[PDB]
Every structure is written in C-alpha cells, then in structure tokens.
C-alpha cells in the first residue's frame, strides 16, 4: 500500500486518506525572482493558504527547439521544491497553453513556424510538440519524487486551459483534441487527479473547474467529482492604455463564501501574488509590466491591506468550520426573501452554518437557531459550531493600507546613444511581422523607395500628397524622407492602425520608412495565433498625376530590431564597447534614443521602483537583466468612478488611475542590485528627459 496518495470523491480532493477543503493561491515562478519565492511563499502560509497554485511557462523554458532553460527565475524545480518547504502543496497548471495574459498565451514563437503546425486542435505536429513538453515536465516532477503520491508537493495537475469554449467554435476536431489531450495526461502517470478549467466535456478521470469572479452554481460533469474553483479573479490585469483595476476584499470574501457554502472545496486567489512582467517574452498583447491584480500580495510582494488580512481571516473561519465541511454536505434552510442558511451538520454532531445575505441593497437581521445575526447586503456570516458568528465577509477587521513611493539617492549622470533610421532581405510585398523577426525583438523596420516625376501636379503648385498607411499593430512610426512624420499606437482590443497624413516630397527617389513595433503578443481567442502584427496595408499615396499609388504593390526592404539590440547596449560588455554622448549634448525628448548611467543600491531592506513619468515608451535593463518594457506616455483611459463591494462585480467596477500614466513606476528586484556599479540602461522608443528618472524605495502604511 501507497504511504502517500492523492484521489477524490463527491465531497473533496483526498490527500493521504484525509478529504480537505483546499484554500489556493496562484503565484508565477517567473513573475518574481528567486530571492522573493520565500518570502512570498511564507506570506501566503501565514494568509492561510494550503496550496500554490502556477502555471508552467513553455516559451521561457524552450527558447527554441530542444534548448531548454530552467535557470534563475525559470528554476521551476527549485521554486516546487520552496512551496514544499513551506508545507504547502501544488496545483501545476501545465498546460501548455496557459494563456495568463502572457506572451504567445505561452507558446513558443517558433512552434507557429513548424511544417503543418496549427495550435490547439487535433494536429499532429502540435500534438507531438505538446505531448513532448507536458512529458517532459512531468517526468522531471517525477524524477524528484514531487508529485505527492511520492511524497512531493504536487496534489492535482492541469492540461490546457479553458479549451472548452474554442470546442465551441471550431467544433469536432476540437471534441477529439480535447479527448486526447484528457488520455495523454492521464497517461502520464503522475499518481495525483488531472483538471481541466472550463470543460464541461472532460473525460473522466480528469475533473472539470471553473474560472471566474463568481463560481457558487458550478457542479463539475459528474456527481463523483469535487467541485474546484481554479481562479478566483482578485481583480484584473493592467493594460498599457487602461485603469488600474481593483477587486473589493468584501465581494472577493463573499464569492469565497458563497462557493464553500454550495459544497465547494477547492478554490485558488488568481492572482495571490501578481508580481511583474519582466524582460520582453513575458507580457502579452498591450499587458503592462506590473502584473499587480490587486493580488492580496502587491507586485513588490507587500502585503496589500485590508485585503490580505480579510482573506487571512476568512480562511481562518473555513479552518474551523473544516472538520464539519468534510463530514457533511450542504443542507439549505431557507431564512427570507434572499437569505439562507447553508448548514454542514455531521451525523457525530459537528456543525458549521454559513448565514447568507444575497440583496446587494438592503441588510437583513436574521434568526437562526433561536439567535438574532444582520447580515450587511452582500454579505455572508460563518458560524464554524453553528452557534457564534466569527466572521461576516462585509466586515473589515484589518485596517487598510496605502502606497508610498519615496524617493532615494537622488538623480544620475547620463549618457545617450542615438539609433539611426534606415532606409532602403527584401520582398515584393509586405511581409507579416512575427513572420520576419520570430518575435526577437518588438521592432522591424519597412523600408521602400518612393520615386516621383518632374511633372507632379503638387510640385507645380507647391501641395504636399497625402500617405495612408494601414498596419495590424501595434505602434507605427512613419518617416519620410528621414524625418518623423506621424506615431500612431492601438489598443489591446484595437491594435491595428491607421496612419494618414500629408507628406513633403521631391522630384526623384523619395525614403519611406516605418518603424513597426509590437507590444507583447496575443494571448487568448480562437486562433489567436493567427492574428497578424505590422505593416500589411493598405498603404497608399495620393494626389499624384495617377490618382492614388498602391504601395504595396513594389519592393519593400526589411530591417529586424535595432542597432542598440545588435550591439546589446543593454549589458555592461556591450554598452562599453561603444562611445557615449556625454554632457551637454545629452540627447532630450528625441526618439530613438539609449540612455545610461550608473547607480549604487540604496540601503536597506524596501522594495525598490524607478520613476520613469518623466520617459514616453521603451525598454528598461539593469546589470543587463530586462526590468521590463515601460509605457508612462500612454494615459490611462476608460472609466472611473466610486464603487460599492456590494451586488455583482465585473473587472471594470473598481477601476482607478483614469487620465494619469498606465505605468509610472517600474519594479527593480533587489536581489539584481550590488552594492555599487549598478548599470541602468533604458531604451527610449519615444521621447523622454532621463534626468528625472529617480529610484524609490516603497512601502505601505
Ligand atoms: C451539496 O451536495 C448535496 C449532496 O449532493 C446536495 O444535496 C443533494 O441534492 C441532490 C440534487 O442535486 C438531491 O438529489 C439529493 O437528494 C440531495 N441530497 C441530500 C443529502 O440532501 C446539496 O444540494 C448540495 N448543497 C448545495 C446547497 O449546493
Ligand atoms: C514569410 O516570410 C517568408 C520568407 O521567409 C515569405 O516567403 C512569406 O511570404 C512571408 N509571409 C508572410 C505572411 O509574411
Ligand atoms: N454571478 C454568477 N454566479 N455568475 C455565474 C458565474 C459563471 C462561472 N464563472 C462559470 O464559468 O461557470
Ligand atoms: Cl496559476
Ligand atoms: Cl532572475
Ligand atoms: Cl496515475
Ligand atoms: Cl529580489
């Protein structure tokens, strides 16, 4: 007999014969660094949490075919091992699409490449590329003994993800892929439960989940099954363009409670620490930096009051009530109009009651076994002994926190190092953007020749013609004749554009060329992959003799990336080995341009951000290692106003920042500072005054 297991039946997940009522958390290995899984880990064990729950990041782990990366803050094994340290267990969301507004949903960008591939259907070469990859990390688990049918942390594991609504559309190959990737999973041998989130059709044994701000009527597909709750949304994620959303501690408590009332006994915070989008491969489409969530751990990995404590408490609440929830279903009285009593009453007498108040409007006093309790709108009061309310999810008893970004060490000294603008690997055409780059930089550049006759119309009477240029997205930069003559930029439900502007030109050969710049890639949506990025066109030129020239029918040039990119002007090796402009000189509110300086670490023990509201849109590095892509020149945009706990939430609720900076402040993780001779390197795409980029030191109080 096994001396550790995993199985499940009606009531709950059974972890070594015992069934449990599992209180979750996501956290992304590589949204933090290996210095804060610790502590970050330590923080959810001391707000309650049972389990870490983390997808599996497949285009940070396999860069390209059969080249593998697990190091630094890709050190997966390392990370399972610290959450086991802790005495909490696993929920790995292989995938291997994970989608969690990450980039390519976490695909590969070369796996779009491969003869015959297409994603997320019943494909030979994707299924062989994907069975190969959820092996591979299964069987690494496994030579570790981390599934906790071994002893290990790891109690459930995830395929695909929330594949059932791209069944609906694309129909049977779909229903056959989902089959088989149920029985390929399964067929791993793990010895612990597979899910599948949103798959009403999941073949037994896999047991289907639910995703959402609210799950309380989800019954997974067969009575034997637990009924699990995979995302507990906290909030939502943060787009460049867009507010900063929060997610009420009051309505998150009461959609906790409303799900462990109706037989639930697995739910998992998404996002319990949000954390940061570093580097370059890890935001998706028009995702920002911060990945913050209004997580119960903010992105700097602070606990993010009163929210945290609320949860802390809640969970407190369900420990109590436990030994009745797994000894007992369920049973509803009803106490009004809209008000009931979901009551756990265990044939030995143990008995938990959760006091329900579903009127967002109007509080109710209710009585329950001859005892009086009010419940606020919107609330629910747990009673772990049926007798004492401990807690009600409307009532805060942790005092609240706000942030505070303090500056510290004062300005730097600067130096720049233009980029130049090219101009006219070529094509007759226009070729799509992941196409020519295979995603290794944001940039490309599509250059072409404009020849015009002596006998222009507007020449003679001195008129400038008038340039359209179409593109997918997600940002165009339009030069002509070296000279910037337009930005446009989209929107993460827009990113296509449309630049349209009169444009000076001579007799003879003219120079157009367009900067393309993309901005994480698509991560969700029915063939997703497929969406194109850059310049396709139309691209047209009128008020010529002709009419209008179609430009997209003759010879187009192109440029991958930037010269800085070439000569890595992000490292220390790299930035030293070219001339800097220095001093007066300095390049200022010019696009195109690198900036560096050099900075010792602040002392102490806070966590640590760069004020960038002084810069417009690029790249930031420091010690060669990518903080992550800043955008503080594009506002915030959408709609924020005051907002109640109470009645249903929907991500755009609680929405603050309307009109100020997406982004301002960009997360520096302590653990890549050294004492002295900290290089900060800062690509600028746009514009910006790096004199007023400062470090801060945050906190909360
Ligand atoms: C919790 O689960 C129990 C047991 O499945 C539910 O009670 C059963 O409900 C089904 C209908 O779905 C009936 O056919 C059974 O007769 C019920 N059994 C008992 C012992 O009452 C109960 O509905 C669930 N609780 C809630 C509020 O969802
Ligand atoms: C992709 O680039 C190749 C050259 O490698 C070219 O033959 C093809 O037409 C391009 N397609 C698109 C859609 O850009
Ligand atoms: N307010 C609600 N309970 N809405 C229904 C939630 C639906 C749930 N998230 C699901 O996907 O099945
Ligand atoms: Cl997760
Ligand atoms: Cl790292
Ligand atoms: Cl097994
Ligand atoms: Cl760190």
């Given at each position: ?39 970050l880990i330590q923080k959810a064990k001391d ?300 044939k030995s007498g143990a008995c938990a009651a ?288 005051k907002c109640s706990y109470a009645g249903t ?53």
């Amino acid at each position: 007999e096994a001396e550790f297991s995993v199985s499940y039946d009606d009531r709950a997940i059974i972890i070594n014969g015992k069934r449990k009522i599992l209180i979750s958390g996501s956290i992304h290995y590589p949204r933090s660094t290996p210095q804060m899984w610790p502590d970050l880990i330590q923080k959810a064990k001391d707000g309650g949490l049972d389990v870490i729950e983390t997808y599996v990041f497949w285009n940070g782990h396999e860069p390209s075919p059969g080249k593998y990366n697990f190091e630094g803050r890709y050190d997966l094994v390392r990370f399972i091992k610290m959450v086991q340290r802790a005495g909490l267990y696993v929920n790995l969301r292989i995938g291997p699409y994970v989608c969690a507004e990450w980039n390519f949903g976490g695909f590969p960008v070369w796996l779009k490449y491969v003869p015959g591939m297409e994603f997320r259907t019943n494909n030979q070469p994707f299924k062989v590329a994907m069975q190969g990859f959820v092996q591979k990390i299964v069987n690494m688990m496994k030579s570790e003994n981390l599934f906790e049918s071994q002893g290990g942390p790891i109690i459930m594991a995830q395929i695909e993800n929330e594949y059932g609504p791209v069944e609906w559309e694309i129909g049977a190959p779909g229903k056959a892929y989902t089959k088989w990737a149920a029985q390929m999973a399964v067929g791993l041998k793990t010895g612990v439960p597979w899910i599948m989130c949103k798959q009403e059709d999941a073949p037994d044994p896999v047991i289907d989940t639910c995703n959402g701000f609210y799950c309380e009527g989800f019954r997974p597909n067969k009575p034997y099954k637990p009924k699990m709750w995979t995302e507990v949304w906290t909030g939502w994620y943060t787009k460049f363009g867009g507010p900063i959303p929060q997610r009420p501690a009051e309505d998150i408590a009461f959609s906790v409670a409303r799900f462990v009332q109706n037989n639930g006994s697995f739910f998992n915070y998404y996002m319990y620490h949000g954390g940061t989008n570093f580097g370059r491969t890890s935001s998706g489409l028009f995702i920002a930096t911060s990945y913050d969530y209004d997580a119960p751990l903010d992105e700097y990995g602070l606990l993010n009051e009163p929210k945290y404590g609320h949860l802390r408490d809640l969970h407190k609440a369900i420990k109590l009530s436990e030994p009745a929830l797994v000894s007992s279903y369920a049973a509803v009285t009803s106490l009004g109009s809209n008000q009931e009593a979901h009551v756990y009453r265990s044939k030995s007498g143990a008995c938990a009651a959760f006091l329900s108040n579903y009127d967002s409007r109007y509080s109710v006093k209710v009585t329950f076994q001859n005892r009086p309790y009010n419940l606020p709108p919107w609330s629910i009061s747990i009673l772990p002994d049926c007798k004492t309310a401990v807690y009600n999810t409307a009532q805060v008893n942790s005092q609240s926190s706000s942030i505070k970004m303090t500056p510290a060490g004062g300005g730097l000294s600067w130096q720049s190092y233009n980029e130049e603008t090219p101009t006219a690997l070529t094509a007759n055409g226009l070729w799509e953007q992941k196409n020519v780059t295979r995603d290794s930089s944001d940039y490309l550049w599509y250059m072409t020749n404009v020849n015009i006759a002596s006998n222009e119309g507007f020449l003679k009477n001195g008129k400038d013609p008038y340039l359209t240029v179409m593109s997918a997205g997600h940002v165009l930069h339009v030069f002509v004749n070296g000279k910037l003559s337009g930005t446009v930029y989209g929107t993460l439900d827009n990113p296509k554009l449309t630049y349209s502007g009169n444009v000076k030109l001579r007799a003879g050969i003219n120079k157009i060329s367009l900067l393309s710049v993309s901005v994480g890639l698509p991560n969700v949506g029915v063939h997703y992959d497929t969406w194109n990025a850059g310049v396709l066109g139309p691209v047209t030129l009128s008020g010529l003799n002709e009419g209008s020239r179609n430009l997209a029918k003759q010879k187009w040039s192109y440029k991958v990336g930037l010269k800085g990119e070439s000569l890595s002007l992000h490292s220390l090796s790299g930035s030293s080995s070219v001339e800097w402009v220095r001093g007066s000189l300095m390049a200022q509110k010019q696009p195109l341009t690198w900036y560096k300086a050099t900075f010792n670490a602040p002392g102490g023990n806070d966590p640590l951000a760069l004020d960038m509201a002084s810069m417009g849109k690029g790249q930031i590095w420091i010690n060669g290692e990518g903080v992550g892509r800043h955008w503080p020149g594009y506002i915030a945009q959408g709609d924020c106003s005051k907002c109640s706990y109470a009645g249903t939430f929907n991500e755009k609720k609680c929405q603050t920042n309307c009109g100020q900076p997406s982004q301002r402040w960009y997360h520096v993780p302590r653990s890549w500072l050294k004492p002295s001779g900290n290089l900060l390197v800062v690509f600028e795409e746009w514009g910006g005054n790096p004199t007023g980029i400062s470090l801060v030191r945050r906190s909360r109080s």
